[PDB]
Design a binder for this molecule. Structure first.
Ligand code: BCB
Ligand code: BCB
Ligand code: BCB
Ligand code: BCB
Ligand SMILES: C/C=C1/c2cc3[nH]c4c(c3C)C(=O)[C@H](C(=O)OC)c4c3nc(cc4[nH]c(cc(n2)[C@@H]1C)c(C(C)=O)c4C)[C@@H](C)[C@@H]3CCC(=O)OC/C=C(\C)CCC[C@H](C)CCC[C@H](C)CCCC(C)C
Ligand SMILES: C/C=C1\c2cc3[nH]c4c(c3C)C(=O)[C@H](C(=O)OC)c4c3nc(cc4[nH]c(cc(n2)[C@@H]1C)c(C(C)=O)c4C)[C@@H](C)[C@@H]3CCC(=O)OC/C=C(\C)CCC[C@H](C)CCC[C@H](C)CCCC(C)C
Ligand SMILES: CC(C)=CCC/C(C)=C/CC/C(C)=C/CC/C(C)=C/CC/C(C)=C/CC/C(C)=C/CC/C(C)=C/CC1=C(C)C(=O)c2ccccc2C1=O
Ligand code: HEC
Ligand code: HEC
Ligand code: HEC
Ligand code: HEC
Ligand SMILES: [Fe+2]
Lengths: 323, 332, 243, 273
């Protein structure tokens, strides 16, 4: 039983390695350090981080958004610090409650929300430029940034795209712990049970698959760690017994297998698709589908159960019943 | 943090839909002993005699009752409303025909209200009906009432903290939260839905696709409406000490027929009946009540689902005094 | 009139549903599953145009590999069945078959980013050290499956690219040679090193390295495989069923 | 029938029980005893689903549902038609799952690799037992288990949830959901990094392990390392269920109220109340 896959027994300590980017080598900041405990279940080196214009930008607009959200939250408890620590999970900054169409809503009723949302978009837009540029600098592919952009796209979908397409800012997600969680039920109910939106189904099936694939993949690498399976880059360019035993494990189990390069394509795809499926489902909701349950009832998909308790007429249809 | 097993579960849906009540037996009991306190029906009396419209001086409601039946009604009323204070709470000790004290005039309107509930609302209250006790439980001010803003504690026989008090702005969110089963839902569902009939609870479309002319822009109902309806349901659920599957199949909250239960239709009359009591009987009592009973906006205390149900799907577990006290309803 | 309804009994959401299913199965069957066939294809006993990797330290490599020599495999047929297992002819550990098999990797040393040897001992790695608090194995005895002292640790071999220990070098007692072992096969203790994968006698037959202070990709496999082959081939009991 | 490098590994042994009698291949698949006990439990599992589906009103795969019994049946045998089938299917499913798990142990021994995948496959099996066996055992009836339908099982999850008003406030759920999100986030990163190092674009050279590290050091100021991420990914995936199971099994046997109210313990502490 390999104890190395549980934890690093003996730790190495060497001089710090610095891969030179095509620009911004001057923009690395900080003297690195080492945590003995972290180096037991990971790499011991902490730092240094890279600065850059796109990094600072994300920290500037991200802080501005956060400061706005926190200020309106503090406001909600009439600026009582003890009642801030206490009620924090329940506190939020809300989209307009009143309908103003697409017109810029009052600062008291969604203005600060829309402005906190703009700076979050600028922050998100900035960090992506950092995830992208840092890859080009080190001569790498932009695979990470395109997966990141898909996730940003989903945020923009539920944040500002859907409110725009249906024509009401009131539809967007509140800022807050419970509050943004409360939107999920508001949104589902309004559009007739998200369990009957096919793209939710796809999104879940990919998220569920992401659990499978990473559990499976991670366990596979750990299973072949004794042959240096963890050195994946050189296992792709020069097939080692590690990924042979790995490929054969699956080919004897499930009947088909991947290569060590392609399983990272299976996982990259399945991740991306979570967000793509999610994005499409939102885009279709409100614009083209109003009640996903009745949309399923139309195309004959929704299951039917008999009555346990007796069939109950809608009393608003009975003769002489109030409005 | 937690509650020890076993649990008490029922079934309200087709096997394997996970529909039904989840109850903690010890809590169900803690309620049962509290609802058992209900005073037993006073022994029936001599039917023969002259009506109290002739016998007495100032009887505007119970005039068709004989004196013997009339004083039995008064005693019963005294048990349910002010048993610590006795007859003197509404009455001038020297003059029982005088309207000096406000609980008198309020009680006559209460008498009219109680008779309305049993007569015009059997769609909800059925053959069980209500008495003065259903709400009051032995105190002039009923334990669970509602003002035009959320107040704490929900049981006004308990002392609130400074934070729980309505003057303290910093407890507003918590005041709001405890009325909606501890949610963060930023809506007062009482003043929105039960204080009057101005708003519509239903928010889900009954068509698969978006209907042209109400699906875009200012023609739309804001998403807030969905949040608020949800708020009401958390409140309704906590009020009766139950859950969603007691009245809905979550598959589709909007659909009736097999997807709803008979309890949902009964609940539907509940909303109509609560609205009727608030607008026509309870809110107009502000002019007859002293300010110490009124809210900050000059309103009188009004009722919700909790007022009668107090954590139980049937108020006092379906205990009735309908036959024993027929003068309180129904009225032919 | 509705938003999104089309001709007949068809709506937009219905169309995108199909387009979704097609997109997925397109990529699954025509892309992702073809990328799976870049190793071990074509089959023996729907192909992608070969992929060329431009290596970090000079040269290029096209997959899958075809070796100018096929290695003879000392395995005998058990049955005449198509998918019948194979029983070893000779000594399966030194022959290197089954769990003892090694891949035909390049006889080159794994390289660090700047061009130095990646897997080296601590006698060369003079700016590398064992972290304070951890057990320095150098000098502790190495005890095998039978409970017999097979050798003494002499050095550690560090991966300079990741700063991670990958091998233990031990002298095999009475056999005037050293052997490498993966740390995966080493239960590191304060007083000894426990190795259950192979018996005490088998250590002498661990694959030897061409050079003392460096190790090729193929060598790294030969060594690693050897011990894993032991997990099935140490005693005659380790092959049969457990119950 | 074989990969260009497969022949050498196709050796006898590694079996837990059976010896030579079950140790063989049928195509790419490995058999063994647990493959036999799998195909049996699968065959008996799928043959009964179809027999119950014929007696059902529909054959539309989205609408079909084989439901467990009513709550009155408790832990006893139900009428085959009125919940009995469901009980027979469960035994088959569990019989096939465990068989499938142990079969992977046989393949791991032969390949001389760790038993990590079959050990990681247990965690799903455990969550299946949580929903179908352990919770219905704690609540008194098999009627609390989810139905076997494509769309109907969603309807069970829906109702189950709303039985506690707002399941999002369930702290076991929050834990579970966060892992789902972070593990799908993690996978995209690990897949994206490896691909970026091997496929830099145009005529650019393949990069190294130092490049991997420098990227995550630059972007987030920390790098976990090549092996570590595969350990983290198993941990992050395994904790979708391992923590979730606690939020599932408390709902009912250990907690009856709404899940938001549970956060009263925090909100109702006297000195800030
Ligand atoms: C408490 C949590 C529950 C839940 C909540 C849930 C939700 C909210 C949603 C699903 C969805 C799905 N679930 Mg479900 N689920 C499923 C399977 C399914 C699929 C029908 C579907 C796709 C998920 C996916 O791709 O995963 C990842 C696995 C992958 C990608 C590998 C491929 C698996 C393959 C697609 C599964 C096909 C199963 C078939 C019915 C075949 C059954 C075998 C036959 C031959 C007898 C199984 C087999 C089980 C078991 C055995 O426990 C299960 C348990 C549960 N689900 C729990 C009860 N599930 C999604 C759906 O849209 O359903 C209609 C969905 O939105
Ligand atoms: C009543 C409640 C329902 C509901 C309501 C719901 C809604 C309204 C929506 C979903 C959606 C989804 N639901 Mg779902 N749901 C899901 C799972 C899912 C996801 C697969 C999917 C996408 C969510 C996501 O991944 O975002 C997580 C990832 C995000 C949010 C991206 C973050 C990345 C970002 C770029 C980084 C930003 C972070 C910054 C650092 C922060 C800085 C900001 C500062 C300024 C404050 C499961 C597994 C179940 C089960 C088991 O029942 C379920 C049931 C329900 N959902 C109930 C039916 N669900 C989404 C969907 O797919 O719709 C079609 C969706 O829109
Ligand atoms: C349709 C999908 C929605 C959804 C549905 C949802 C559900 C159902 C649940 C949450 C929950 C959460 N969501 Mg939400 N969510 C959140 C954030 C949150 C968190 C408050 C929480 C945890 C999720 C998590 O772990 O992610 C993954 C986190 C990642 C990838 C970052 C890892 C950071 C790591 C911890 C950092 C460690 C470094 C140390 C600090 C350094 C140590 C220094 C020392 C030496 C943000 C910031 C956003 C956006 C879009 O900006 C968002 C959008 C959505 N959520 C959509 C609206 N969310 C959970 C919760 O508890 O809420 C009550 C929860 O149960
Ligand atoms: C009203 C609905 C609510 C709800 C109700 C709910 C309930 C009741 C339960 C969950 C649970 C969970 N919810 Mg959910 N939920 C989730 C996500 C999740 C999961 C993280 C978590 C665990 C899922 C599970 O146990 O799978 C189970 C899947 C299993 C066990 C897979 C079976 C594997 C099997 C052995 C293999 C299958 C073999 C096939 C037959 C083979 C196929 C062969 C083919 C290929 C030929 C998200 C992300 C959201 C969002 C975004 O809103 C959400 C909202 C909601 N949940 C709503 C608020 N949720 C679970 C939880 O942990 O609660 C705390 C849970 O019990
Ligand atoms: C399938 C798709 C998945 C996915 C994919 C990917 N996700 C990526 C990438 C990919 C590919 C990266 O490239 C990028 C990254 O770098 O990875 C390490 C990234 C990221 N995903 C983060 C969070 C996240 N992903 C979530 C979900 C999914 N992601 C889904 C599941 C969720 C959920 C579930 O809620 C969360 C919360 C951040 C860590 C990071 C954005 C940084 C940012 O934009 O922050 C910028 C904001 C700041 C710098 C402000 C910080 C405040 C400071 C301290 C100010 C001081 C405060 C002071 C009090 C004020 C005075
Ligand atoms: C972190 C934990 C994650 C995780 C991890 C891992 N997952 C693994 C491994 C690891 C490590 C592998 O070793 C193994 C494998 O080899 O894969 C390549 C496996 C597997 N995971 C599968 C499905 C899967 N993983 C899910 C979830 C997670 N996995 C979570 C996220 C989900 C969800 C959530 O829906 C599904 C559907 C199968 C493909 C496979 C076994 C099938 C089987 O044993 O074959 C044999 C069985 C059959 C072929 C059919 C059986 C028929 C029965 C008798 C009758 C059917 C009744 C049934 C109950 C009907 C209900 C359906 C209804 C609800 C609609
Ligand atoms: C014909 C007959 C009856 C024969 C008898 C023999 C017998 C017992 C046969 C079994 C019969 C059965 C039940 C067969 C069905 C097999 C099953 C369960 C198939 C399900 C397959 C599915 C849908 C899996 C979903 C997971 C998924 C996304 C897989 C695609 C990606 C792949 C191939 C992942 C596997 C994989 C992973 C996870 C790696 O980490 C890895 C690392 C390095 C190299 C290769 C790999 C690799 O191939
Ligand atoms: C407030 C809740 C009351 C309590 C407690 C008691 N009484 Fe009462 N009294 C009340 C009302 C609303 C009325 C008029 C009813 C109507 O139909 O209009 C009365 C009237 C009487 C009378 C008749 C006096 C007269 O009009 O001449 C009597 C004799 C009387 N009440 C007796 C009585 C006794 C003995 C009580 C204590 C047990 C008692 N009442 C309680 C309001 C309330
Ligand atoms: C019975 C006592 C109920 C319980 C428990 C819950 N709800 Fe309900 N719901 C009930 C009624 C009588 C009505 C109709 C009100 C009217 O005046 O028309 C509703 C309505 C809803 C709706 C709106 C459906 C629509 O037609 O648009 C939703 C979305 C809803 N209810 C959800 C819901 C939830 C989430 C509950 C749990 C907290 C819940 N309801 C409890 C009766 C009852
Ligand atoms: C007091 C005047 C009441 C108020 C205010 C509300 N309800 Fe009620 N309800 C009342 C009685 C006396 C009964 C018993 C009738 C019976 O069937 O025995 C009920 C009953 C219900 C039920 C049905 C309970 C069951 O079938 O087990 C429901 C679902 C119900 N009530 C809901 C409900 C709601 C949602 C209310 C607020 C809008 C509400 N009730 C108010 C008396 C009173
Ligand atoms: C529930 C609804 C009921 C029922 C069935 C009865 N009453 Fe009342 N009552 C109710 C409310 C919401 C209020 C307003 C708050 C308040 O003023 O206490 C009242 C008030 C009274 C009072 C005045 C008490 C006081 O403030 O001094 C009296 C005297 C009274 N009610 C009497 C009464 C009688 C005699 C009833 C039966 C016929 C009766 N109530 C029924 C709510 C409800
Ligand atoms: Fe990997």
């Amino acid at each position: 039983a390999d104890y190395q896959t549980i934890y690093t027994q003996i730790q190495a300590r060497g001089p710090h390695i610095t891969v030179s980017g095509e620009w911004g080598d001057n923009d690395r900041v900080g003297k690195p350090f080492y945590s003995y405990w972290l180096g037991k279940i990971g790499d011991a080196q902490i730092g240094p981080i890279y600065l850059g214009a796109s990094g600072i930008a994300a920290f500037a607009f991200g802080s501005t958004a956060i400061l706005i959200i926190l200020f309106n939250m503090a406001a909600e408890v009439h600026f009582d610090p003890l009642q801030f620590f206490r009620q924090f999970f329940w506190l939020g900054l809300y989209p307009p409650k009143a309908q103003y169409g697409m017109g810029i809503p009052p600062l008291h009723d969604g203005g600060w929300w829309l402005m906190a949302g703009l700076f979050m978009t600028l922050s998100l837009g900035s960090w992506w430029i950092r995830v992208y540029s840092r890859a080009r600098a080190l001569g790498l592919g932009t695979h990470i940034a395109w997966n990141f952009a898909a996730a940003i796209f989903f945020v923009l979908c539920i944040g500002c795209i859907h409110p725009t397409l249906v024509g009401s800012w009131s539809e967007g997600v509140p800022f807050g712990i419970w509050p943004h969680i409360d939107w999920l039920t508001a949104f589902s109910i309004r559009y007739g049970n998200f369990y009957y939106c096919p793209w939710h189904g796809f999104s879940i099936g990919f998220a569920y698959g992401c659990g499978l694939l990473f559990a499976a993949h991670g366990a596979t690498i750990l299973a072949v760690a004794r042959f240096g399976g963890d050195r994946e880059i050189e296992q792709i360019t020069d097939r080692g017994t590690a990924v042979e035993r790995a490929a054969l494990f699956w080919r004897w189990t499930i009947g088909f297998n991947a290569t060590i390069e392609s399983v990272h394509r299976w996982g990259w795809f399945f991740s991306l698709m979570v967000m793509v499926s999610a994005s499409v489902g939102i885009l279709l909701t409100g614009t083209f589908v109003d009640n996903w349950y009745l949309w399923c009832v139309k195309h004959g998909a929704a299951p039917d159960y008999p009555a346990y308790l007796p069939a109950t007429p809608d009393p608003a249809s009975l003769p002489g019943a109030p409005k | 943090c937690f509650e020890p097993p076993p649990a008490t579960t029922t079934q309200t849906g087709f096997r394997g839909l996970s529909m039904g009540e989840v109850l903690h037996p010890a809590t169900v009991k803690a309620k049962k002993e509290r609802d058992a306190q209900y005073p037993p029906a006073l022994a029936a009396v001599k039917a023969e005699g002259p009506p109290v419209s002739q016998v007495y001086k100032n009887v505007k409601v119970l005039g068709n009752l004989t004196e013997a039946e009339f004083l039995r009604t008064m005693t019963a009323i005294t048990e349910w409303v002010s048993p610590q204070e006795g007859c003197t709470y509404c009455h001038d000790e020297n003059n029982l025909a005088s309207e000096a004290k406000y609980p008198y005039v309020v009680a006559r309107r209460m008498l009219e209200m109680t008779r309305a509930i049993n007569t015009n609302w059997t769609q909800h209250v059925a053959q069980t009906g209500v008495t003065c006790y259903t709400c009051h439980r032995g105190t002039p001010l009923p334990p669970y009432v509602r003002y035009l803003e959320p107040t704490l504690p929900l049981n006004n026989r308990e002392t609130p903290t400074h934070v729980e008090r309505v003057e303290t702005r910093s407890g507003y969110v918590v005041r709001l939260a405890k009325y909606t089963a501890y949610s963060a839902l930023n809506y007062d569902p009482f003043t929105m839905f039960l204080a009057n009939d101005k708003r519509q609870v239903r928010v889900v479309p009954q068509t698969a696709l978006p209907l042209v002319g109400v699906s875009r822009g200012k023609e739309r109902r804001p998403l807030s409406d969905a949040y608020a309806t949800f708020a009401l349901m958390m409140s309704i659920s906590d009020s009766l000490g139950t859950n969603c599957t007691f009245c809905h199949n979550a598959q589709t909250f909007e659909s009736w027929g097999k997807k709803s239960t008979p309890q949902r239709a009964i609940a539907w009359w509940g909303i109509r009946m609560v609205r009727d009591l608030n607008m026509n009987y309870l809110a107009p009592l502000n002019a007859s009540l002293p300010a110490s009973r009124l809210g900050r906006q000059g309103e009188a205390p009004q009722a919700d689902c909790r007022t009668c149900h107090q954590g139980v799907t049937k108020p006092l577990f379906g205990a009735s005094r309908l036959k024993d006290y027929p003068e309180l309803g129904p009225i032919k | 009139m509705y938003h999104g309804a089309l001709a007949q009994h068809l709506d937009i959401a219905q169309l995108v549903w199909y387009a979704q299913w097609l997109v997925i199965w397109t990529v699954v069957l025509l892309y992702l599953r073809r990328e799976d066939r870049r190793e071990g294809y074509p089959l023996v006993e729907e192909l992608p145009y070969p992929k060329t990797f431009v290596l970090p330290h000079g040269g290029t490599v096209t997959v899958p590999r075809r070796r100018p020599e096929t290695r003879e495999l000392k395995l005998a047929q058990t049955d005449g069945f198509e998918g019948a297992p194979l029983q070893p002819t000779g000594n399966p550990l030194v022959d290197a078959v089954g769990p003892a098999s090694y891949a035909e990797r390049a006889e080159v040393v794994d390289a660090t980013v700047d061009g130095k040897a990646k897997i080296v001992p601590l006698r060369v790695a003079t700016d590398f050290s064992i972290a304070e608090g951890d057990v320095d194995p150098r000098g502790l005895p190495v005890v095998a499956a039978d409970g017999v002292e097979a050798g003494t640790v002499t050095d550690l071999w560090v991966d300079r690219s990741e700063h991670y220990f990958r091998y233990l070098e031990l002298s095999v007692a009475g056999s005037a040679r050293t052997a490498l072992i993966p740390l995966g096969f080493c239960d590191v203790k304060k007083d000894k090193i426990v190795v259950t994968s192979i018996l005490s006698e088998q250590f002498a037959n661990v694959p030897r390295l061409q050079s003392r202070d460096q190790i090729t990709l193929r060598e790294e496999d030969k060594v690693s495989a050897y011990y894993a082959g032991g997990l099935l081939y140490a005693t005659p009991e380790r092959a049969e069923s457990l119950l | 029938a074989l990969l260009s490098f497969e022949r050498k590994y196709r050796v006898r042994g590694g079996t837990l029980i059976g010896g030579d009698l079950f140790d063989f291949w049928v195509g790419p698949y490995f058999v063994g005893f647990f493959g036999v006990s799998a195909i049996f439990f699968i065959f008996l599992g799928v043959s009964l689903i179809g027999y119950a589906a014929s007696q059902g009103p529909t054959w539309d795969p989205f609408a079909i549902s084989i439901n467990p019994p009513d709550l009155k049946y408790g832990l006893g045998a139900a009428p085959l038609l009125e919940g009995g089938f469901w009980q027979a299917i469960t035994v088959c499913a569990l019989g096939a799952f465990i068989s499938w798990m142990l079969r992977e142990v046989e393949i791991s021994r032969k390949l001389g690799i760790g038993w990590h995948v079959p050990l990681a496959f247990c965690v799903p099996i455990f969550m299946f037992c949580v929903l179908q066996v352990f919770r219905p055992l704690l609540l008194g009836s098999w009627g609390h288990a989810f139905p076997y339908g494509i769309l109907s099982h969603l309807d069970w999850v829906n109702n189950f949830g709303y039985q506690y008003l707002n399941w999002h406030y369930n702290p076991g759920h929050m834990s579970s959901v966060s892992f789902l999100f972070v593990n799908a986030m993690a996978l995209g990163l690990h897949g994206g990094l490896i691909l970026s190092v091997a496929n830099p674009g145009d005529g650019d050279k393949v990069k190294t392990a130092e490049h991997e590290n420098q990227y995550f050091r630059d972007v987030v100021g920390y790098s976990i390392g090549a092996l570590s991420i595969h350990r983290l990914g198993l941990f992050l995936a395994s904790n979708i269920f391992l923590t979730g199971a606690f939020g599932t099994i408390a709902s009912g046997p250990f907690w009856t109220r709404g899940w938001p109210e549970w956060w009263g313990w925090w909100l109702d502490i006297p000195f800030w109340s």
